[PDB]
Design a protein around this ligand. Structure first.
Ligand SMILES: Nc1ncnc2c1ncn2[C@H]1C[C@H](O)[C@@H](COP(=O)(O)O)O1
Ligand SMILES: [Mg+2]
Length: 246
């Protein structure tokens, strides 16, 4: 059983950022995942993870502005190589971060990305998804491909893209679409962005390809308000546990 968390930690919001970074690390410590996929990370935040979550090796998708990051549990996940695929037409520094690792006796290709945000950038977001899905298919058959990140997908844009390739599955859909963790971005239960209206979306998703391995559980994390009266982020974390068939 391997476990991981994907989480957009809202590094772009400056308010209570130090205290919220404490909240994220507190959360990570409780679940102690093998891998962590992060989005909207910024340099000072990165420096903080380096000394507060020192049990993880940190691979960042950039070193300026904001970027993604993949954290690997020292002693359980071994780093092999990394690759950063650019999005030529991104206007928000977005890209595809790939890290090859060994976890147990199995080879994995770990992928994360923060696809273009907002509704008006649907077109570019779809082109970026095609790139990602395409990259998942190129990996050798020997390795297991796991993608987890902030996709910003909505209004069923997955169809325009052409649908998932026949060998790739959405973890949430695979488990039968559990309602308790359907929405990872909810302004009705989350007040960080100060929004009077109620919006619920499944922006954060997990794609994988095999029936070598299958998902076992999916849960939301970071549900506890902090002292400052705000959540660690406007996004909920997403904790997934995949099992391996032997
Ligand atoms: N600049 C701006 N104006 C309009 N609405 C915005 C803006 N930035 C983010 N958002 C909204 C749109 C997304 O659905 C949500 C999460 O973005 P995410 O990138 O997934 O954190 O936040
Ligand atoms: Mg954001």
């Amino acid at each position: 059983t391997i476990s991981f968390i994907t989480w957009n930690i809202d590094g772009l919001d400056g308010c209570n950022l130090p205290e919220r970074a404490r909240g994220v690390c507190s959360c990570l410590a409780l679940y102690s995942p093998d891998v962590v996929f992060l989005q909207e990370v910024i340099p000072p935040y990165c420096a903080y993870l380096k000394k507060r979550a020192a049990s993880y090796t940190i691979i960042t998708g950039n070193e300026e502005g904001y970027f993604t990051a993949i954290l690997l549990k020292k002693g359980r996940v071994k780093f092999k190589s990394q690759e950063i695929i650019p999005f030529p037409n991104t206007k928000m520094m977005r890209n595809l971060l790939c890290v090859n690792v060994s976890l147990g006796g199995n080879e994995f290709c770990l992928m994360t990305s923060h696809l273009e945000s907002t509704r008006e950038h649907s077109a570019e977001r779809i082109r970026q998804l095609k790139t990602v899905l395409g990259k998942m298919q190129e990996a050798p058959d020997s390795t297991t491909v796991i993608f987890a990140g902030d996709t910003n997908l909505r209004d069923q844009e997955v169809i325009k893209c052409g649908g998932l390739p026949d060998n790739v599955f959405d973890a949430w859909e695979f488990l039968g679409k559990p309602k308790h963790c359907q929405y990872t971005w909810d302004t009705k239960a989350n007040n960080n962005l100060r929004i009077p209206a109620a919006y619920k979306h499944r922006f954060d998703r997990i794609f994988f390809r095999a029936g070598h391995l299958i998902p076992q559980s999916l849960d939301l994390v970071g549900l506890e308000k902090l002292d400052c009266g705000r959540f660690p982020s406007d996004h909920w974390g997403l904790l997934c546990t995949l099992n391996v068939v032997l």
